[PDB]
Design an enzyme around this catalytic site. Structure first.
Site, short mmCIF file in Angstrom:
data_model
loop_
_atom_site.label_atom_id
_atom_site.label_comp_id
_atom_site.label_asym_id
_atom_site.label_seq_id
_atom_site.Cartn_x
_atom_site.Cartn_y
_atom_site.Cartn_z
N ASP B 25 0.83 -1.20 0.00
CA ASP B 25 0.00 0.00 0.00
C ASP B 25 0.87 1.26 0.00
O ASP B 25 1.23 1.79 1.06
CB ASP B 25 -0.92 -0.06 1.21
N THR B 26 1.18 1.77 -1.19
CA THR B 26 2.03 2.95 -1.29
C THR B 26 1.34 4.21 -0.76
O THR B 26 2.02 5.19 -0.44
CB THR B 26 2.49 3.16 -2.73
N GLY B 27 0.01 4.20 -0.64
CA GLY B 27 -0.70 5.31 -0.04
C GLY B 27 -0.75 5.32 1.48
O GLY B 27 -1.37 6.20 2.07
C1 NG4 Z 1 -6.89 -0.66 2.20
C2 NG4 Z 1 -6.56 0.83 2.32
C3 NG4 Z 1 -6.77 1.28 3.76
C4 NG4 Z 1 -7.45 1.61 1.36
N1 NG4 Z 1 -7.09 3.02 1.32
C5 NG4 Z 1 -5.95 3.44 0.53
C6 NG4 Z 1 -4.75 3.71 1.44
O1 NG4 Z 1 -3.60 3.89 0.68
C7 NG4 Z 1 -4.98 4.96 2.29
C8 NG4 Z 1 -4.93 6.22 1.43
C9 NG4 Z 1 -5.05 7.42 2.36
C10 NG4 Z 1 -6.40 7.80 2.96
C11 NG4 Z 1 -6.49 8.99 3.91
C12 NG4 Z 1 -5.25 9.80 4.24
C13 NG4 Z 1 -3.91 9.42 3.64
C14 NG4 Z 1 -3.81 8.23 2.70
N2 NG4 Z 1 -3.89 5.06 3.24
C15 NG4 Z 1 -4.06 4.86 4.65
O2 NG4 Z 1 -5.13 4.68 5.16
O3 NG4 Z 1 -2.86 4.87 5.37
C16 NG4 Z 1 -2.90 4.85 6.87
C17 NG4 Z 1 -2.04 4.07 7.26
O4 NG4 Z 1 -0.75 4.88 7.19
C18 NG4 Z 1 -1.19 6.31 7.40
O5 NG4 Z 1 -0.71 7.23 6.12
C19 NG4 Z 1 -1.77 7.59 5.47
C20 NG4 Z 1 -2.92 7.45 6.45
C21 NG4 Z 1 -2.44 6.30 7.43
S1 NG4 Z 1 -8.42 4.10 1.39
O6 NG4 Z 1 -8.02 5.49 1.20
O7 NG4 Z 1 -9.08 3.99 2.69
C22 NG4 Z 1 -9.53 3.53 0.11
C23 NG4 Z 1 -10.73 2.70 0.54
C24 NG4 Z 1 -11.67 2.17 -0.51
C25 NG4 Z 1 -11.38 2.48 -1.97
C26 NG4 Z 1 -12.32 1.93 -3.03
O8 NG4 Z 1 -11.50 1.34 -4.00
C27 NG4 Z 1 -13.14 3.04 -3.66
O9 NG4 Z 1 -14.06 2.44 -4.53
C28 NG4 Z 1 -10.17 3.30 -2.39
C29 NG4 Z 1 -9.22 3.83 -1.34
#
Ligand code: NG4
Lengths: 99, 99
Positions: B25-27
């Site tokens: 998970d690069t995000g």
């Molecule tokens: C499985 C993952 C949890 C999924 N996710 C993407 C992650 O990469 C997320 C991206 C992100 C969200 C908010 C703030 C910053 C980054 N990262 C993140 O939660 O990271 C945690 C941990 O480390 C900390 O750094 C960052 C914030 C802290 S998501 O966004 O919930 C999402 C959910 C459903 C969809 C469906 O596909 C739509 O249909 C698309 C995208």
């Protein structure tokens, strides 16, 4: 190019005639963008992650340019804290993970 | 390996001696795993995602093997929807994005 992950993989995108910064996110199936008033029809959706769910608007066949690489696909618009480029568009720009 | 993104980048990990599946998970800044038993001390922490903030247990300096590559770092344990490997460990195994 090659992007290391010491810092967040943020890149400039162009969508709806606007430039924005967004994460290249291998952990997102789909692409989620900050609130913006795009034209056209949309469908409601709820998406969930850490902390729970947010409500978004699903727009289909949206043109989006990522680092000069053109793509077209579904984008979800809503109160996300960050712009998220998901796998539905990352595949279209030829993006891979490598280690 | 080179991992394409038409499918979720799921890999097997080893932590606390047990095998699990996790998402590259690069995000994600941080690594967050679903509720589990882990040996050692921990500290209560908060982490925020797309849907808000959750309470997690922070385990520092934890041995974890990801797709055959060893890492030693911080692992957060709590009510995440999916086991996610974040940049804190992706950097340790030499993971980059390429397009
Ligand atoms: C499985 C993952 C949890 C999924 N996710 C993407 C992650 O990469 C997320 C991206 C992100 C969200 C908010 C703030 C910053 C980054 N990262 C993140 O939660 O990271 C945690 C941990 O480390 C900390 O750094 C960052 C914030 C802290 S998501 O966004 O919930 C999402 C959910 C459903 C969809 C469906 O596909 C739509 O249909 C698309 C995208």
């Amino acid at each position: 190019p090659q992007i290391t992950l010491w810092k967040r993989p943020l890149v400039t995108i162009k969508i709806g005639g606007q430039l924005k910064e967004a994460l290249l996110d291998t952990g997102a199936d789909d692409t989620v963008l900050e609130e913006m008033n795009l034209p056209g029809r949309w469908k409601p959706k709820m998406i969930g992650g850490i902390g729970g769910f947010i409500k978004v608007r699903q727009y289909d066949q949206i043109l989006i340019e990522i680092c000069g690489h053109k793509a077209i696909g579904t984008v979800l618009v809503g109160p996300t804290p960050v712009n998220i480029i998901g796998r539905n568009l990352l595949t279209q720009i030829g993006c891979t993970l490598n280690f």
